[PDB]
Symmetry: C3
Subunit: 313 residues, 3 copies
């Protein structure tokens, strides 16, 4: 497929800095070259430079609101530009707050998009429900139209217009959901497959239902926001908020292989890879390796094999 | 839910001593505080003091019969007392021989109970089939009415009256069953899902069928006897008889989440946690952490999230 | 069941030497004694002595063609002899190129055989599609009747006559398939369950369909060629070409338990165990332990338990 890569070396959605090295380590892993080794037409739109906002005091509990809000504003622009050039946006994060900008800019071009959110967390705290104040745990609240009425005017975010409905998103992988987040889930009727449903149904039925849920009525472009902590920390240890009992490497690949097969992948976030948090060099390479793998699957790399349209015999 | 905690620091059902520290390490992990953090009304009935029986020579092959038999006699009493106060008995072991006392005292109050036994082993050796002589591998033989005729009068156990039928118990997790135990399984028509059935059906169908099997005819209180070695040693390494190829952490939580949802959990054993056997400090915390997790799930903690009956928005 | 063990200490199908120690380490693990502990009638046909072919230069890209071709010629003979004595051939490898000889000699006695190939790889490169030149990645091309027309006369292999059709083989476990191999798969209509299908269906349905596929029309003897790298390297690390995201230890046992239950297991290869490649002593024992386990399952050892035809009570 045809891809537009955008690096988002940004960390101010949470406390730990190392996540701004995500684009660097993924690139160094050979992400671009590997995509080209596939059937892929790849344009690198470069790493976004996120200007310092040195004056950025908390809004109530919410931390670094202006830095976070600007970075997403910049990113939305960049994504919209790549979507206009007919390319699948590939955002290398960076913390998950960047999801506000990536989905936003994506929906500017394709308002009918549907979102699949792979994550141990729902990231749906409002600035009023959050207890941490970390904006990487709130991006979904800023995007949901139904929640427009419970989001205060947070400095840095006046540019935002909620662009998805509670029924345009499916979560997969949930296993550490805050109480206010759970309340929002059940109240807005959000579709989710927590680890419990994955256990119950198997990842096969999960993907069946998820795609049926989003694509049933009609075909529409897909946005996959992949938080690497959605996968078990035995595969992606170098990440800020690891939770045990995650999706397996195999489930990870299955999800993305199935998404690729729809032919409707339109936007992709690979988020929260933080090399600094690897207890060892191998934990770092293990995490980065898994991240590349998930990404390659999104763009056609299949476990059964791939071949070019020729006669190999 | 409403819980009555009882510590059973007892080890004489098997050779290794460290298992009598189970209640201590689980308590230190924050078990009680965490239960209270949930919707839980918790009363701690304390650690049972198991008086020394210094004169306790083998009965044939059977080791420490009087100590084991007394500890279970004491425990049955304690459980019956907590069942009378309208509380879910939570026995922190301690080796699995304590199951004789816990189920016994439970059935005194609720004779119509059904048992779910999560374990790598069937624990159904008689004093005549056992080759080890370790009573933690025999508790089920002492409780089955059908086996009353093949249990010799073992000193310490004259107080016991078999209280469950072959058709009131379901095993989940089996993967190291002795030949005599397998003979008993197939002869008495015992319902089991070994690791093979879990592999074949998926833990979803397993729980479906297990609950359907026990609750089909009518609702009745549930006794969950959970041997931590039911789970793979990659999750619960600090245990006396680990067997590879176990239930995953996720399957472990799925079982207990589903049991919680029945609303019929009546008695619970968390057994065979032995800190002394952790090859490292982290193996010890890993085991204890998993044990708490399984327990919290039994009393309502859900992977999809929990919220109080209020409007979080 | 009734077994004829044959050691094949052979490595010239690939670069690393340690794999010729496979028979030694498996024997030292207690394989024969453990089989006898089961219901098993076991005859050891010894370790085949594979004479040096010091003059064995590449055929085009293909390495050690004469050594590989001779070893398989010798092995086919040995297998046919054990099949004539009414025994299940058990070939301890050794690299997977030996599969050419084992299936060949097997089919001499039982031409209607069906093959189950458990592996991360398809091993179906021709001498013209291979890029590595390693013959352990080509054995299936030498055996398929449909490919007879695309196999050059490679020195050492004039004795070979393709003995299976594209529709007599099922792959399970695939996750690193070369492009030419994938082309062959889809062109010849080969039945496979890659890790993707295992993820989608569950190992239960996979085995259901695999056996239905091979045994549907009529009963026929089964050849299981098991490459230990079919399993995840977290279980079988000491092997030449490990690929992450493999079959679990549990799936491994499930496959073989189900195959045993058909009562049609006729030939078995346990291949690619290489002690030299264990990063630690425990990685070596871990691999060998898993290999024995898979083998024991093939010959009746069940996770639910086994008992002799007697009254244990
Ligand atoms: C406690 C937490 N829910 C954690 C959010 C984690 C964010 B991530 O990794 O992007 O999913 C919060 O801060 O609101
Ligand atoms: C060999 C064995 N079957 C082991 C029993 C293990 C007891 B446990 O951990 O409570 O399940 C025996 O001693 O009878
Ligand atoms: C790249 C590879 N496909 C690897 C083959 C591996 C062989 B094994 O372990 O027996 O499956 C090739 O050499 O043709
Ligand atoms: Mn997360
Ligand atoms: Mn996230
Ligand atoms: Mn046990
Ligand atoms: Mn037990
Ligand atoms: Mn292989
Ligand atoms: Mn192979």
């Amino acid at each position: 497929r045809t891809i537009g890569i955008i690096g988002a070396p940004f960390s101010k959605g949470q406390p730990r800095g190392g996540v701004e090295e995500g684009p660097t380590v993924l690139r160094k892993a050979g992400l671009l070259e590997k995509l080209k080794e596939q059937e892929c037409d790849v344009k690198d739109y470069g790493d976004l430079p996120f200007a310092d906002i040195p004056n950025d005091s908390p809004f109530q509990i919410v931390k670094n609101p202006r830095s976070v809000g600007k970075a997403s504003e910049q990113l939305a622009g960049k994504v919209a530009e790549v979507k206009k050039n007919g390319r699948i946006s590939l955002v290398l994060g960076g913390d998950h707050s960047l999801a506000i900008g990536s989905i936003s800019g994506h929906a500017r071009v394709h308002p009918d998009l549907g979102v699949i959110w792979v994550d141990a967390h729902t990231d749906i705290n409002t600035p009023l429900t959050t207890t941490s104040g970390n904006l990487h745990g709130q991006p979904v609240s800023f995007l949901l139209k139904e929640l427009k009425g419970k989001i205060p005017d947070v400095p840095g975010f006046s540019w935002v217009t909620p662009c998805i409905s509670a029924k345009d998103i499916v979560y997969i992988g949930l296993r550490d959901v805050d109480p206010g987040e759970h309340y929002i889930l059940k109240t807005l009727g959000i579709k989710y497959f927590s680890m419990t449903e994955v256990d119950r149904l198997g990842i096969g039925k999960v993907m069946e239902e998820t795609l049926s849920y989003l694509l049933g009525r009609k075909k529409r472009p897909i946005h996959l926001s992949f938080d690497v902590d959605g996968l078990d920390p035995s595969f992606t240890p170098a990440t800020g908020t690891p939770v045990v009992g995650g999706l397996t490497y195999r489930e990870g690949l299955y999800i993305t292989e199935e998404i690729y097969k729809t032919g409707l992948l339109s936007g992709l976030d690979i988020m929260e890879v933080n090399p600094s948090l690897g207890k060892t060099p191998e934990e770092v390479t293990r995490t980065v390796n898994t991240a590349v793998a998930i990404t390659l699957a999104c763009f056609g790399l299949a476990r059964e094999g791939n071949h070019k349209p020729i006669d190999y015999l």
